[PDB]
Amino acid sequence: LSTLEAEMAVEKKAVEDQRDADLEARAQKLEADLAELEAEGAKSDVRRKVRDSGEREMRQLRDRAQRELDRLDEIWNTFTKLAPKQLIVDEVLYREL
């Protein structure tokens, strides 16, 4: 159980590091792009729809990373409480187990 939990933590962390790395890159990109938008004369509502679109593309990146964090936690919880007579309907989960 020790080495397994240890390998699971690292795995779950590797996903976390990536989410952070990716999320800061998309934020700097938006900072660069809102910079050109102020450089040129730009309508105010146009500068906000760039941030709105940029903010939404970030929530996607985090949500996707959250999904994998939950899929990984479901794997680890299932395996640790695993007992005979339990029923597994996922089969993509089961394949990972």
Side-chain angles (χ1 to χ4, degrees), residues 1-28 30-36 38-58 60-97:
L1 237 190
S2 58
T3 100
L4 296 175
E5 182 178 30
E7 292 176 341
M8 189 57 201
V10 188
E11 186 163 11
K12 191 196 297 181
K13 166 170 176 281
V15 176
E16 283 177 330
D17 293 330
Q18 297 244 216
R19 162 186 48 92
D20 294 332
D22 298 342
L23 264 172
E24 180 70 21
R26 180 66 176 87
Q28 293 183 4
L30 196 167
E31 279 186 348
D33 305 343
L34 269 185
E36 294 280 18
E38 274 197 352
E40 359 278 317
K43 206 248 291 189
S44 298
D45 183 42
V46 175
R47 324 215 302 277
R48 290 324 173 197
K49 288 196 180 187
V50 184
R51 180 172 291 279
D52 268 337
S53 178
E55 289 176 352
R56 203 39 39 197
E57 295 190 357
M58 288 191 297
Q60 289 180 354
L61 277 145
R62 179 165 278 119
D63 291 348
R64 282 170 177 163
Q66 193 69 296
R67 292 200 295 116
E68 182 172 3
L69 285 174
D70 302 341
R71 281 191 264 103
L72 279 168
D73 276 328
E74 185 187 30
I75 303 177
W76 177 255
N77 285 335
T78 295
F79 165 69
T80 54
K81 333 161 89 82
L82 207 70
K85 283 176 174 60
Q86 292 174 311
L87 221 161
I88 303 177
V89 190
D90 213 319
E91 134 106 63
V92 23
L93 182 181
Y94 178 92
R95 213 61 73 188
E96 232 139 12
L97 302 178

